[PDB]
Design a protein around this nucleic acid. Structure first.
Ligand code: ZN
Length: 63
DNA sequence: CCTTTGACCA
DNA sequence: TGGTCAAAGG
């Protein structure tokens, strides 16, 4: 788990067509905060990863 | 503390 | 067929 500045707890594991790859759902945890993050790969580029942030953090940016 | 995996209900 | 939690280990 790459630490970019937050705490995330991996959750779930499903595969999607059109992009033969398994998706992952990361959920940030914090005493009073809870945000979700999605990570997907690019069919034509297994090295390229996508990150989507849904929500907001109410506990400053950690290490 | 923190994560990998199998099943529900319509 | 989609989207999520829950039991256990170093
Ligand atoms: Zn947060």
């Amino acid at each position: 788990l790459l630490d970019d500045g937050y705490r995330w707890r991996k959750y779930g594991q499903k595969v999607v067509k059109g992009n033969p790859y398994p998706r992952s759902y990361y959920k940030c945890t914090t005493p009073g905060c809870g945000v979700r993050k999605h990570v997907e790969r690019a069919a034509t580029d297994p090295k390229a990863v996508v990150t989507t942030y849904e929500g907001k953090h109410n506990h400053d940016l950690p290490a």
